[PDB]
């Protein structure tokens, strides 16, 4: 009945995102028809694969270069890709640190190696803290080879962490991710974009 564990999403829930900026940054390095490729769906394949760790970062970049027909550098590709990521506001880092007093806090994120490296270097470090300080464990799609909202990802987390779904609260801005978690017995909250969800924890 009582909540012991939190499962927190990264994208949106912690880190602000900017798809427009990322798309435009790709166009600037030469991916002229990236919006045109998005419809083609040639893209969705490479992004979905990266998200499940099914291709390496080297493959991802090669795949981008191949779709661009241009020999842009890894540094360029990473910069354009990482520009999807904006910031984790520090009040959310304070909140995570505080929540640890009462809850075992886990991260459960669909993400990829390039983005994860970026947030660990540029968003999580704060005061004397690093990413290891906020979470008991970080569950990442690309490491797990599964992605939300597949039921198996949630079951894998609860099995690995050794937790009761019924004692678990999941915060994720995707409605379908939450509905799947609910079917497993996990309680959920679906914040809106830019929502400060600290209100959930007011005494």
| Helices 19-29 and 74-82, packing angle to 10 deg | 160
- Give me the sign of the Cα torsion angle 131, 186, 188, 168: negative
Supply the minimum distance, in Å, between the C-beta of residue 170 and Na ion: 11
Tell whether residue 53 is a contact of Cl ion (CB under 5 A). no
Tell whether residue 158 is a contact of Cl ion (CB under 5 A). no
Q: Alpha-carbon distance 91 to 201, whole Å?
A: 14
Tell whether residue 132 is a contact of Na ion (CB under 5 A). yes
Tell whether residue 44 is a contact of Na ion (CB under 5 A). no
Is residue 18 among the annotated active site residues?
Answer: no
Local structure of 198: helix, strand or coil: helix
* Residues making up the chain, counted from first to last: 203
Q: What share of the chain is helix, strand, coil (3-state, %, to 5)?
A: 50, 15, 35
Site for Cl ion (CB under 5 A): which residue of 5, 7, 8, 11? 11
Q: State the binding partner of 109 from Cl ion, Na ion, none, CB within 5 to 8 A by kind.
A: Cl ion
> Binding site membership: which residues?
9, 11, 172-173
Radius of gyration of the chain (CA): 18
Nearer to Cl ion among residue 65 and residue 139 (C-beta): 139
Tell whether residue 147 is a contact of Na ion (CB under 5 A). no
Interface ranges with Na ion (CB under 5 A): 9, 11-12, 132, 173
The residues annotated as belonging to the active site are 9
């Amino acid at each position: 009945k009582g909540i012991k564990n939190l499962l927190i999403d990264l994208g949106g829930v912690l880190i602000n995102l900017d798809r427009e900026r990322c798309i435009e940054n790709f166009k600037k390095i030469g991916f002229q028809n990236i919006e045109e490729k998005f419809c083609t769906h040639q893209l969705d394949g490479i992004f979905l694969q990266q998200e499940k760790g099914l291709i390496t970062p080297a493959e991802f970049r090669d795949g981008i270069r191949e779709m661009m027909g241009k020999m842009v550098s890894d540094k360029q590709i990473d910069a354009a890709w990482n520009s999807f990521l904006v910031d984790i506001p520090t009040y959310k880092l304070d909140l995570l640190l505080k929540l640890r007093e009462k809850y075992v806090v886990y991260l459960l994120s669909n993400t990829n190696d390039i983005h994860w490296k970026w947030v660990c270097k540029n968003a999580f470090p704060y005061r004397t803290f690093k990413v290891e300080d906020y979470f008991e464990k970080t569950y990442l799609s690309y490491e797990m080879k599964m992605a939300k909202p597949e039921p198996e990802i949630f079951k894998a987390v609860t099995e690995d962490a050794g937790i009761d779904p019924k004692e678990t609260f999941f915060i994720d801005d995707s409605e379908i991710n939450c509905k799947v978690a609910q079917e497993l017995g996990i309680s959920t909250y679906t914040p809106k974009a830019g929502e400060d969800w600290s209100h959930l924890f007011r005494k």
